Protein backbone atom coordinates (compact mmCIF):
# COMPACT_ATOMS: atom_id res chain seq x y z
CA UNK A 1 0.00 0.00 0.00
CA UNK A 2 1.28 3.49 -0.86
CA UNK A 3 1.78 6.25 1.68
CA UNK A 4 -0.87 8.31 -0.12
CA UNK A 5 -3.45 5.50 0.20
CA UNK A 6 -2.69 5.08 3.90
CA UNK A 7 -3.24 8.82 4.39
CA UNK A 8 -6.45 8.77 2.33
CA UNK A 9 -7.94 5.92 4.34
CA UNK A 10 -6.91 7.53 7.62
CA UNK A 11 -8.36 10.90 6.57
CA UNK A 12 -11.63 9.14 5.72
CA UNK A 13 -11.56 7.55 9.16
CA UNK A 14 -10.94 10.92 10.81
CA UNK A 15 -13.78 12.54 8.86
CA UNK A 16 -16.10 9.71 9.92
CA UNK A 17 -14.94 10.14 13.54
CA UNK A 18 -15.97 13.78 13.36
CA UNK A 19 -19.35 13.02 11.76
CA UNK A 20 -20.07 10.37 14.40
CA UNK A 21 -19.09 12.95 17.02
CA UNK A 22 -21.52 15.48 15.52
CA UNK A 23 -24.42 13.01 15.49
CA UNK A 24 -23.76 11.72 19.00
CA UNK A 25 -23.81 15.34 20.20
CA UNK A 26 -27.00 16.21 18.30
CA UNK A 27 -28.57 13.09 19.79
CA UNK A 28 -27.37 14.34 23.17
CA UNK A 29 -29.19 17.64 22.76
CA UNK A 30 -32.33 15.73 21.73
CA UNK A 31 -32.18 13.40 24.74
CA UNK A 32 -31.64 16.38 27.06
CA UNK A 33 -34.77 18.01 25.63
CA UNK A 34 -36.68 14.76 26.18
CA UNK A 35 -35.38 14.60 29.74
CA UNK A 36 -36.69 18.09 30.44
CA UNK A 37 -40.20 16.75 29.78
CA UNK A 38 -40.14 13.66 32.01
CA UNK A 39 -41.13 13.62 35.68
CA UNK A 40 -38.36 13.83 38.27
CA UNK A 41 -37.30 10.42 39.58
CA UNK A 42 -34.79 9.00 42.04
CA UNK A 43 -32.80 7.44 39.18
CA UNK A 44 -32.77 8.18 35.45
CA UNK A 45 -35.73 6.42 33.83
CA UNK A 46 -35.07 4.51 30.61
CA UNK A 47 -38.16 2.47 29.78
CA UNK A 48 -36.82 -1.08 29.21
CA UNK A 49 -39.33 -2.04 26.51
CA UNK A 50 -38.51 1.04 24.46
CA UNK A 51 -34.79 0.44 24.99
CA UNK A 52 -34.91 -3.23 23.99
CA UNK A 53 -37.03 -2.35 20.96
CA UNK A 54 -34.57 0.38 19.92
CA UNK A 55 -31.57 -1.95 20.28
CA UNK A 56 -33.27 -4.75 18.36
CA UNK A 57 -34.24 -2.34 15.56
CA UNK A 58 -30.66 -1.06 15.34
CA UNK A 59 -29.56 -4.70 15.13
CA UNK A 60 -32.12 -5.37 12.39
CA UNK A 61 -30.45 -2.62 10.33
CA UNK A 62 -26.92 -3.95 11.02
CA UNK A 63 -25.46 -4.94 7.65
CA UNK A 64 -21.97 -3.67 8.53
CA UNK A 65 -18.81 -5.60 9.38
CA UNK A 66 -19.46 -5.78 13.13
CA UNK A 67 -21.25 -8.54 15.01
CA UNK A 68 -24.64 -7.64 16.44
CA UNK A 69 -23.33 -7.94 20.00
CA UNK A 70 -20.61 -5.36 19.23
CA UNK A 71 -23.14 -2.90 17.80
CA UNK A 72 -25.44 -3.51 20.79
CA UNK A 73 -22.60 -2.83 23.24
CA UNK A 74 -21.55 0.40 21.55
CA UNK A 75 -25.12 1.69 21.44
CA UNK A 76 -25.68 0.74 25.08
CA UNK A 77 -22.70 2.96 25.93
CA UNK A 78 -24.10 5.81 23.81
CA UNK A 79 -27.51 5.38 25.49
CA UNK A 80 -26.03 5.33 29.00
CA UNK A 81 -24.09 8.53 28.31
CA UNK A 82 -27.37 10.08 27.19
CA UNK A 83 -29.03 9.06 30.46
CA UNK A 84 -26.21 10.58 32.51
CA UNK A 85 -26.85 13.78 30.54
CA UNK A 86 -30.54 13.91 31.54
Author numbering: 1 to 86
Quote what the paper states about this structure:
BsCM_2 crystals complexed with citrate (BsCM_2-CIT) and substrate analogue chlorogenic acid (BsCM_2-CGA) diffracted up to 1.9 Å and 1.8 Å resolution, respectively. BsCM_2-CIT and BsCM_2-CGA structures contain four and two monomers per asymmetric unit, respectively. At active site S1, the chlorogenic acid makes hydrogen bonds with the side chain of Arg27, Lys38, Gln86, and the main chain atoms of Arg45, Asp47, and Phe79 of chain B. The ligand molecule also interacts with Lys38, Arg50, and Lys80 of chain B, and Arg10 of chain A through water bridge formation. The citrate molecule interacts with the residues Arg27, Lys38, Asp47 and Gln86 of chain A and Arg10 of adjacent chain B through hydrogen bonding, and similarly in chain C, and chain D. The citrate molecule also makes additional interactions with the residues Arg27, Arg50 and Phe79 via water bridge formation. Position and interactions of the citrate with the protein differ from chlorogenic acid. However, citrate only makes a hydrogen bond with Lys38 and does not have any polar contact with Arg45 and Lys80. Additionally, Phe79 backbone atoms form direct interactions with chlorogenic acid, but form water mediated interaction with citrate.
In B. subtilis, regulation of DAHP synthase is thought to be controlled by its N-terminal domain (BsCM_2), which has residual chorismate mutase activity. A functional trimer has three active sites formed at the interface of two monomers. However, BsCM_2 forms an entirely helical dimeric structure with two active site clefts which are formed by the residue contributions from both monomers, as previously described.
